[PDB]
CSV table of C-alpha atoms in Angstrom, one decimal:
chain,number,residue,atom,x,y,z
A,1,UNK,CA,-1.9,4.3,-26.3
A,2,UNK,CA,-0.8,2.3,-22.4
A,3,UNK,CA,-3.7,1.9,-21.2
A,4,UNK,CA,-5.5,1.9,-17.8
A,5,UNK,CA,-7.6,-0.9,-17.4
A,6,UNK,CA,-6.8,-2.6,-13.8
A,7,UNK,CA,-6.5,-6.2,-15.7
A,8,UNK,CA,-3.8,-4.8,-18.0
A,9,UNK,CA,-1.7,-3.7,-14.9
A,10,UNK,CA,1.7,-5.6,-14.1
A,11,UNK,CA,3.1,-7.1,-11.1
A,12,UNK,CA,6.0,-7.6,-8.9
A,13,UNK,CA,7.2,-11.3,-10.9
A,14,UNK,CA,7.6,-13.9,-9.0
A,15,UNK,CA,6.7,-12.4,-5.4
A,16,UNK,CA,8.6,-14.0,-1.9
A,17,UNK,CA,6.3,-13.5,0.8
A,18,UNK,CA,9.7,-14.6,3.3
A,19,UNK,CA,11.8,-11.9,1.7
A,20,UNK,CA,9.3,-8.9,1.8
A,21,UNK,CA,8.4,-9.0,5.6
A,22,UNK,CA,10.0,-6.7,7.6
A,23,UNK,CA,8.8,-2.8,8.4
A,24,UNK,CA,8.2,-0.7,5.8
A,25,UNK,CA,8.0,3.4,6.0
A,26,UNK,CA,5.8,4.8,3.7
A,27,UNK,CA,6.9,8.2,1.8
A,28,UNK,CA,4.3,8.6,-0.3
A,29,UNK,CA,0.0,7.7,-0.8
A,30,UNK,CA,-2.2,8.4,-3.9
A,31,UNK,CA,-5.9,8.3,-1.6
A,32,UNK,CA,-9.1,6.7,-2.5
A,33,UNK,CA,-12.1,8.5,-1.8
A,34,UNK,CA,-13.1,8.8,2.1
A,35,UNK,CA,-9.8,8.1,3.4
A,36,UNK,CA,-8.4,6.7,6.4
A,37,UNK,CA,-4.5,7.2,7.5
A,38,UNK,CA,-3.1,10.8,6.9
A,39,UNK,CA,0.2,10.0,8.1
A,40,UNK,CA,2.5,8.5,10.2
A,41,UNK,CA,2.3,5.3,9.0
A,42,UNK,CA,4.2,2.0,9.3
A,43,UNK,CA,3.9,-1.0,8.2
A,44,UNK,CA,5.4,-4.9,9.6
A,45,UNK,CA,4.1,-7.6,7.8
A,46,UNK,CA,5.2,-11.2,9.3
A,47,UNK,CA,4.8,-14.3,7.0
A,48,UNK,CA,4.3,-17.7,8.7
A,49,UNK,CA,5.1,-21.5,8.5
A,50,UNK,CA,2.4,-22.0,6.4
A,51,UNK,CA,2.9,-19.3,4.4
A,52,UNK,CA,0.4,-17.0,5.4
A,53,UNK,CA,1.3,-13.2,5.8
A,54,UNK,CA,0.0,-10.6,7.6
A,55,UNK,CA,0.3,-6.7,8.9
A,56,UNK,CA,0.2,-4.5,11.3
A,57,UNK,CA,0.0,-0.6,11.1
A,58,UNK,CA,0.1,2.3,12.9
A,59,UNK,CA,-0.6,5.7,11.1
A,60,UNK,CA,-3.2,8.9,12.8
A,61,UNK,CA,-6.5,9.1,11.9
A,62,UNK,CA,-8.2,12.2,12.0
A,63,UNK,CA,-11.4,12.0,13.4
A,64,UNK,CA,-14.9,13.1,11.8
A,65,UNK,CA,-14.7,15.3,14.6
A,66,UNK,CA,-11.1,17.0,14.3
A,67,UNK,CA,-9.6,13.8,17.0
A,68,UNK,CA,-7.0,12.9,15.7
A,69,UNK,CA,-5.9,9.4,16.9
A,70,UNK,CA,-3.1,6.7,16.6
A,71,UNK,CA,-5.1,4.3,14.7
A,72,UNK,CA,-3.2,0.1,15.3
A,73,UNK,CA,-4.5,-1.8,12.3
A,74,UNK,CA,-4.1,-5.2,11.8
A,75,UNK,CA,-4.7,-7.4,7.7
A,76,UNK,CA,-4.6,-11.1,7.0
A,77,UNK,CA,-3.9,-11.9,3.4
A,78,UNK,CA,-5.3,-14.7,1.3
A,79,UNK,CA,-3.6,-16.1,-1.9
A,80,UNK,CA,-4.6,-16.2,-4.8
A,81,UNK,CA,-3.3,-17.6,-8.5
A,82,UNK,CA,-1.2,-14.5,-8.5
A,83,UNK,CA,1.8,-14.3,-6.5
A,84,UNK,CA,2.2,-10.8,-5.7
A,85,UNK,CA,-2.1,-10.4,-6.2
A,86,UNK,CA,-3.7,-11.0,-2.0
A,87,UNK,CA,-7.6,-10.2,-1.2
A,88,UNK,CA,-6.9,-8.2,2.6
A,89,UNK,CA,-9.1,-8.4,5.5
A,90,UNK,CA,-8.0,-6.3,7.5
A,91,UNK,CA,-10.1,-4.3,11.1
A,92,UNK,CA,-8.5,-2.3,13.8
A,93,UNK,CA,-8.1,-2.7,17.3
A,94,UNK,CA,-9.9,0.1,18.2
A,95,UNK,CA,-13.7,-0.7,16.9
A,96,UNK,CA,-14.3,2.2,15.6
A,97,UNK,CA,-11.8,1.9,13.5
A,98,UNK,CA,-12.8,0.8,9.6
A,99,UNK,CA,-13.6,-2.4,8.0
A,100,UNK,CA,-12.8,-4.8,5.0
A,101,UNK,CA,-11.9,-5.8,2.4
A,102,UNK,CA,-9.6,-5.2,-0.1
A,103,UNK,CA,-7.2,-6.3,-3.2
A,104,UNK,CA,-4.0,-5.8,-1.9
A,105,UNK,CA,-1.4,-6.1,-5.1
A,106,UNK,CA,2.2,-5.5,-4.6
A,107,UNK,CA,3.3,-3.6,-8.4
A,108,UNK,CA,7.2,-4.0,-8.3
A,109,UNK,CA,9.5,-4.1,-5.6
A,110,UNK,CA,13.4,-5.2,-4.3
A,111,UNK,CA,12.5,-6.3,-1.5
A,112,UNK,CA,15.4,-4.1,0.4
A,113,UNK,CA,14.6,-0.7,-0.1
A,114,UNK,CA,11.1,0.2,-2.4
A,115,UNK,CA,7.9,-1.5,-2.9
A,116,UNK,CA,4.7,0.2,-4.5
A,117,UNK,CA,1.8,-1.0,-3.7
A,118,UNK,CA,-2.1,-0.4,-5.2
A,119,UNK,CA,-5.2,-1.2,-4.7
A,120,UNK,CA,-8.3,-0.5,-7.2
A,121,UNK,CA,-11.8,-0.8,-4.6
A,122,UNK,CA,-14.1,0.1,-7.5
A,123,UNK,CA,-14.2,-0.9,-10.8
A,124,UNK,CA,-15.6,1.8,-14.0
A,125,UNK,CA,-17.2,0.3,-16.3
A,126,UNK,CA,-14.9,0.0,-18.4
A,127,UNK,CA,-12.0,-2.1,-16.9
A,128,UNK,CA,-10.7,1.3,-15.4
A,129,UNK,CA,-10.7,2.2,-12.0
A,130,UNK,CA,-13.1,4.6,-10.4
A,131,UNK,CA,-11.8,4.5,-6.8
A,132,UNK,CA,-7.9,3.9,-6.0
A,133,UNK,CA,-4.7,4.0,-3.0
A,134,UNK,CA,-1.3,3.4,-3.1
A,135,UNK,CA,1.3,3.3,-1.4
A,136,UNK,CA,4.7,4.0,-1.9
A,137,UNK,CA,7.3,1.9,0.9
A,138,UNK,CA,11.1,2.3,1.7
A,139,UNK,CA,13.2,0.3,4.4
A,140,UNK,CA,15.1,3.7,5.0
A,141,UNK,CA,13.3,6.5,7.0
A,142,UNK,CA,15.6,8.1,5.0
A,143,UNK,CA,14.4,7.7,1.6
A,144,UNK,CA,15.3,6.2,-2.1
A,145,UNK,CA,17.7,6.9,-4.2
A,146,UNK,CA,17.3,8.8,-6.9
A,147,UNK,CA,18.2,5.5,-8.9
A,148,UNK,CA,15.0,4.0,-6.7
A,149,UNK,CA,13.6,7.3,-7.5
A,150,UNK,CA,13.0,7.1,-10.9
A,151,UNK,CA,12.1,3.2,-11.0
A,152,UNK,CA,8.7,4.1,-8.8
A,153,UNK,CA,8.0,6.9,-11.6
A,154,UNK,CA,7.8,5.1,-13.5
A,155,UNK,CA,5.6,2.4,-11.9
A,156,UNK,CA,3.4,5.2,-10.8
A,157,UNK,CA,3.0,6.3,-13.9
A,158,UNK,CA,2.3,2.6,-15.2
A,159,UNK,CA,-0.6,2.4,-12.9
A,160,UNK,CA,-2.0,5.8,-14.5
A,161,UNK,CA,-1.6,7.5,-11.2
A,162,UNK,CA,1.1,9.8,-12.0
A,163,UNK,CA,1.1,13.0,-10.2
A,164,UNK,CA,-1.3,11.8,-8.0
A,165,UNK,CA,0.2,11.1,-4.9
A,166,UNK,CA,1.8,12.8,-1.6
A,167,UNK,CA,4.6,12.8,0.5
A,168,UNK,CA,3.5,11.5,3.7
A,169,UNK,CA,5.6,13.0,6.9
A,170,UNK,CA,6.4,11.2,10.2
A,171,UNK,CA,7.0,13.0,13.3
A,172,UNK,CA,6.2,10.8,15.8
A,173,UNK,CA,3.0,10.6,16.6
A,174,UNK,CA,2.2,7.4,17.2
A,175,UNK,CA,5.6,6.7,19.0
A,176,UNK,CA,8.1,7.5,16.6
């Protein structure tokens, strides 16, 4: 019944870039193929005078060679016809870190407690997502109330990603 085509997923109505600014702690994540960013992920979003949103993030990355490293990442966002859907250009301070461009959609947020983000990197021929990623963020590192958890589970189902997220630990690895 419920549809899994990317094009039918709802996004945050009248998304407010200025109210979304600030620190966000990743509480859970659904990984894409060839995952990057393992844990200890914290993002800081900013909006300039002209309305251009940007963000920085820190997180542990397991190098293919088994070294663990703390990645310092940067992303700039371009607005689209949908205030909640952006195109994100990203790179790291260290040249060996992943660089690219991915869609960045704000599925839902209350601005003060939680946010649900989603990106589909590759579309299947049917319109469904063949490779996606999603982060659940919180304003407080302690988490969300049960009432918010209820809303998050629902959005997760709506993205056809129910049961596919893992909890993200924070142990100060990248200084936290």
